[PDB]
Amino acid sequence: FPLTSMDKAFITVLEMTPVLGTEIINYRDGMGRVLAQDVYAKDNLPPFPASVKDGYAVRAADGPGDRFIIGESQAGEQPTQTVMPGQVMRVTTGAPIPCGADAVVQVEDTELIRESDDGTEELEVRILVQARPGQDIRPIGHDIKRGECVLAKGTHMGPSEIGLLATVGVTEVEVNKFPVVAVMSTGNELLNPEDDLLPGKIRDSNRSTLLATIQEHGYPTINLGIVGDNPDDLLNALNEGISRADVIITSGGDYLKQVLDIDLHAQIHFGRVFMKPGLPTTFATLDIDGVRKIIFALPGNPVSAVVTCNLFVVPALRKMQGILDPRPTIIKARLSCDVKLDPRPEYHRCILTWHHQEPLPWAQSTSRLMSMRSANGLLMLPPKTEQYVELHKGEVVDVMVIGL
Amino acid sequence: FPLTSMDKAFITVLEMTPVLGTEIINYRDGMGRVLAQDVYAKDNLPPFPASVKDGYAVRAADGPGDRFIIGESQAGEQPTQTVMPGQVMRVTTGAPIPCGADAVVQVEDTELIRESDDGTEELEVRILVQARPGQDIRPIGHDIKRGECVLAKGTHMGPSEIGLLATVGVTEVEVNKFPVVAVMSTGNELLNPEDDLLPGKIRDSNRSTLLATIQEHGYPTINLGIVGDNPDDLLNALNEGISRADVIITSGGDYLKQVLDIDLHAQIHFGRVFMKPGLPTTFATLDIDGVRKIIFALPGNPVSAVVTCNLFVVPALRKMQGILDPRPTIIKARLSCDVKLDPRPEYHRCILTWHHQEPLPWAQSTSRLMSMRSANGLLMLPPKTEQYVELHKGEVVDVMVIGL
């Protein structure tokens, strides 16, 4: 297979990966989902004019002076009295403004004159200021108007978006589906983690690592187990993956390519990338029954598997789930140590760290405390060149965020 | 209640919040968990000397020359032959090195001499180089040694840590428990999201927002519903929370404090914070049956609830689940617009954005594309002072990461 450049490989993954269809879900399951419909309000917020303050709903045209308090409007109740000249109604923040009143005067701008004998009721109050019409009242529809679009299709939902659906009472929404991702490992040397060692064998760690990475991003997964490195077993496992899942990931193992090509008639878009690590990374698509499955065969080395998973698989999954720009976030950071550059673009897991009052983070390449912490970035080193053969501590480089 | 400074409030939450006890879990459930035990390897990795390359396992003392190939060692099998003078054994990467061989010569440093008539077997090969002892062999225990501590207590686990547990076959581990968090809303004006509006009422959004925020961080939650703003109903709901959960969060609503103090005998550590928004935030602890419950009563305003939840609740939860430094990550960013400073420290949701080849991100305070994206930071504005009454676009400020 020819050596594909990193840029060609990445663009190829994004271009060939489909966007999944849509489904209707309950709002509370919306975390990380992308809306496939515009969402409109069916009510005004607030639906009644509401007091912004504790105080009194007044007729501004009465001006300052001594008023009879005819009642109280409290949150959650509809007032039934009309405020007439020389009257006011006590209000609390959020309470509906009664008919007849056109402003609110906050309590600090008043002095109580008389209180019921028992002391439970305010009877008369002096209004010390001249209210302007509308003052301290949130009018109907100030925050949201009926028929307004409050969230657009393409919005990637978090907690506040869920709370907005709640506010407008839209509890069922159309969203893109999440990809189901099947993971298998291939290699005759592999045992399950639960197993004791046997001669010549080691425990499979890549399956757990990859499954955990995908789960961390919120996508459902299928564990396809360890698969013998031979055509028959590979074909059976791939067939199961294709049946159960939208995406299949393998690591290890050239029978894989032979099965994909000759047995499955998949399109293998690249089988080698000019990158370090991850040279042997393979990406294929399969069009079957009107839909497109995507298949990644990652290298068996566990650092390579982790790295290629973050570079190629995660952005594909983000596209599949409807995210409009599925590219990862890249930030600037300072190198923590010198690095000789390789002819290939090189990627290294690191821990981004922000120091007191220093504007750029440091990228620590994986003392006491750093070993307590999971990698949250991928240092992206440029390929070797005439001028640049080495980079030094303190120099600013790109780091892909993969974890903060 | 007296006005507590932000710093005193934050330190108080962290100091008074307990660390939860421990439980044993399966490794695959380890995402985001903190190990409560050191983890030791029970085997060497690799457990046998392994070839780093495709090539031939040789006796370095034979030097270069023409060799008989006596067999092949492949991954997953224990070789049963001993390599003698003038012999070599074909090896693939990861295969065990057979007795008698002390180095590996990569295939590119050889030329095949004879192949079986059928062409399926290599019979003789010319070794073109002088191997050094140990060359291209990963020795037993190179990566991990038996009895080595591979993860320390206090490690906050991600995908690679899970994969490390798999590698060493430690499938059950002691971890700190996750806090169970109960959320309720109080307010006579509130209806469930599922409800049509009635006069004077609005839909409760804070419960969904807060529950989604807590769930986003991985903690189990209990929905305690809308609670009438009166002592009897508040006491019943708080009692249910205390029974079912480690942490209780309310928003809205002064009956709450009265119930906490007089009915529950909770310790209310502060009831007002000098901050904007979030002035009325209340934090209390209750020691009952030998354990400590924590209670937050957040303001009813939905921006305030979100903001105080991120500032005070999330760091408490991170402490409860065993994270050794539970403080949030604060980074430097550039203001996107001018801001007049308030006498209180002020917190505003924003979207952090990194621009092409610019080292610091911009903090966009919540065009087409920004409305598609959830807030991922909290701008932390300094209190007003003699010299500083305003900050301008481009100026560098602190932003708490709450979402990237």
Partner: peptide, 10 residues
């Protein structure tokens, strides 16, 4: 321009 290849230290 976006690139998945690291850039030289500006």
């Amino acid at each position: 321009d976006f690139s998945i290849v690291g850039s030289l230290p500006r």
